[PDB]
Amino acid sequence: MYYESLTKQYPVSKTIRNELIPIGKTLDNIRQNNILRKQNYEHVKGILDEYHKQLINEALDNCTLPSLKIAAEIYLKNSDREDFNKTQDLLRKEVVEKLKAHENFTKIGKKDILDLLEKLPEDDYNALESFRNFYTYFTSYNKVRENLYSDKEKSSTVAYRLINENFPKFLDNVKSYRFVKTAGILADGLGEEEQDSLFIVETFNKTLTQDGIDTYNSQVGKINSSINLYNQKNRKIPKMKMLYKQILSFQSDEVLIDNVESYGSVLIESLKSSKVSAFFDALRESKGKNVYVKKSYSLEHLNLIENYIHQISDDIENIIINNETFLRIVINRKLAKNRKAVKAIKDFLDSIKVLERELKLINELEKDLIVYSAHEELLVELKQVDSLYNMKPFSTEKVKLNFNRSTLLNRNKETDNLGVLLLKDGKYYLGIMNTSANKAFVNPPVAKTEKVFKKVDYKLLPVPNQMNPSSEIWSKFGFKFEVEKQGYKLTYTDIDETYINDLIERNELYLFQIYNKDFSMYSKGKLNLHTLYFMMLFDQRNIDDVVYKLNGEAEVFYRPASYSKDKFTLHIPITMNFGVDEVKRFNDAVNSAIRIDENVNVIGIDRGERNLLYVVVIDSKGNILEQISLNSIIGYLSQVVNVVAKLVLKYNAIICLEDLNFGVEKQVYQKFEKMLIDKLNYLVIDKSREQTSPKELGGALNALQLTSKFKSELGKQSGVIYYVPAYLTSKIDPTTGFANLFYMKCENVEKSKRFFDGFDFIRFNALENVFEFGFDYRSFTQRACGINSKWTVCTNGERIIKYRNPDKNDEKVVVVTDEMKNLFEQYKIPYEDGRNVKDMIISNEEAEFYRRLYRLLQQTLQMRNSTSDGTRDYIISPVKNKREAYFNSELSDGSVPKDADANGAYNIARKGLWVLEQIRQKSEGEKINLAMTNAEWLEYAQTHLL
């Protein structure tokens, strides 16, 4: 009963360690990227690239696309928008079959391309040769290059480049040429004329190759030169737009800085050029007519134009941060090593990117010819900015993860990558993104197959001061009936398994299965606690009322192979009893729970000589309920701990341990403490796999917390655990309260004579065959040796003695009465009639007599008797108890201590009763003194006896 209030007392943090199993081609991606050592990998990629360019141009050289006429109508005529999108998809198809109809296409991606298709069209040959038998390295490369030959409306495909990008440009030039055929701009250099041939729809078929695009752009530049010349008439003529290239477009730290410095220099000059003013004042003079903005809407309703050009500010920040590139070329060992440089370069390219992103905000078929030509000239300067180099996951010994909208992107040897958690088929997986794919899960495509993952959405609202008088006057989950302790929730999103695969194949995602002995299709037995804590994160019963919070951070550690195993392990910090208010005065909270209850029992745990630990449970009046041992096994300290925890539940009990105050056996004891206090911080009993009723007492979501957070700052109490002096716990007859308090030494005869003159009598009991030594301890010491100091001590029984052996071990069994005879007989003392022989003993003059009398008395007083080999460790008293018997542990029936170690544990438990008397007898809240004096124990031992 008393402990059932001690749930949800304080929050606790754990880090959970689990192994990781690589899934799919993740381990290959990792191993492959451990290239180093330079190697021709990039050289062979370049060779594969140029045959891609060749095959592409050759498949499209003398090509002619049928639907081209259909589409060109829709666009040039007088919804047309959807018919164009449709006929564009038809065209994207028509490009792809022409690409797939080329010879050698079915050897794209297949290893079979290594042979003739590369050894024939050398430095290059040795580079190719070097990747025979190593073809899998281009797996990721192939998955990326696959998108060239796709009819899907994606920006990376050959069909999209030609049909969705270039073809509308080509047609828009056809629309512009009306003004150039008019006004007689017969272009300079177009000798003998017939430039009109460029703006017949059919001429586009000749621009499906890079070499036809070059030719088209070159001549159209000549026209634009004459167009720009036509500005002199003082209305204005739209310039022609250039077509983008066929899709053909980081060796060291020395080379890259010149590229950065160079492009930045070209760019800011281009951004200070007339290109920008021409775009702005064309965009202003368009009055917004036929200008469309991001899936789109037209500016014809307005105000906004001049709110838009004032992103001039993107030019100002490019300029500033280009100047800030003085940290690169003025102030600069490798570049990636530099705190500022890496940041200044990223700040620079980012600022460019936002300019491009801002530009791309514009763009339908009827769009304004002049505005969009100026926009295109300016944008051609920026579309070079796909710089997209790196400075790398599993290069390092660890990767740090974040599960949240919070990743820093720099400490440059410890930057956060995204972690995602994915559930499928009752298993748990960990995905960790390559930084270039961090946004793959921001808006994932809607799931369509049956084979899906459930991705964990990590919803956290930190520090609510995020966002109308001052401080004295809804897409989030916030639940209906400051929010800090409700501002966390996990929710789920179905994601199609093929999308996850695509990222792995592309080397953009590193997916692992989270594994422990309990996460297997072959798993058996109860759950390990850390498996349980982990499961409870995702268990809906916790999401409904949070006990377990996932701290957003996590770390992965990688030991690479060296035909040993590639080992990955995961550490996940978590908080348990998240959002509870920490109980201030926990020890009193327990002391007041005990104060209320009569029925409390005690568990005493002691260090033993033959048992490392001995546990003894006793009731409130002193009776032994259970006395159980180490070596009694029917990771060892974990078992005792798990046992002792059950006993606290089973017996409604507190725990009493030795106070290691003034003082190897005592090292495991301190380990046991630590483990025992650790355990009782947060105790969970129900370790079942099915986990049916975890909200009950001691279930996962209602753990008990019976002890205070371990810190070394500890006094004599830690919750239900109390510490008591070890004084005379093992060397005391529990049935009498008797202990050997004689401070003895055979110093000399004078001081031996009136040591033995302190006894009331020394006599023989012929009937019981023992010698009796009667005395009062007061006659021997000034100490307060309990409330009974009168005793009669008898040469009762056998004793085990270590003894002086010329051969240096031995031990023997002695019967003190018969030796006490042999000595008295040797020295002619008349004992047999039962007189008091005291006056006759102290009359002996020889010291040898007293040496041997001391030894016999000492041996009589030797209550604990042991064997070097554990064969025996028992306690025998030399005093008769309430049962007219001499206490002997070997004759125990379980109602008394079985051995000396048990006696220690028993008498430690008894002192707990004394503290229970202290706790109950004090007031609510007052400090409780637990310093038990040696005199109090002897008093308690001699009165609460048996």
Numbering used by the authors: 1 to 36, 42 to 83, 88 to 130, 134 to 246, 253 to 267, 277 to 321, 373 to 380, 389 to 418, ...
Question: What does the literature reporting this entry say, word for word?
Answer:
Cas12a is a programmable nuclease for adaptive immunity against invading nucleic acids in CRISPR–Cas systems. Among the Cas12a orthologs, Lachnospiraceae bacterium MA2020 (Lb2) Cas12a is the smallest in molecular weight and recognizes a short spacer (14 nt) for cleavage and the creation of indels with high fidelity. Typically, Cas12a exhibits a bilobed architecture: a recognition lobe (the REC1 and REC2 domains), and a nuclease (NUC) lobe (the WED, PI, RuvC, BH, and Nuc domains) for cleaving nucleic acids.
Strikingly, both apo and RNA-bound Lb2Cas12a are present in the asymmetric unit of the crystal. The 20 nucleotides of the crRNA in the complex are well defined in the electron density map. Two flexible loops (Asn33–Asn45 and Lys478–Thr498) connect the REC and NUC lobes. The overall 3D structure of the Lb2Cas12a+crRNA binary complex adopts a triangular, compact conformation. The REC and NUC lobes lie adjacent to each other in 3D space, creating a positively charged cavity in the center. Superposition of the apo Lb2Cas12a and Lb2Cas12a+crRNA binary complex structures demonstrates a 103° rotation of the REC lobe with respect to the α-helix of the WED-I domains of the crRNA complex in its compact conformation. Residues from the region Met493–Leu523 of the WED domain participate in major conformational changes to facilitate the structural rearrangements associated with this rotation. Significantly, the loop-turned-α-helix (Leu477–Lys493) harbors a hydrophobic patch that interacts with Trp871, linking the REC and NUC lobes through the BH and RuvC II suspension helix.
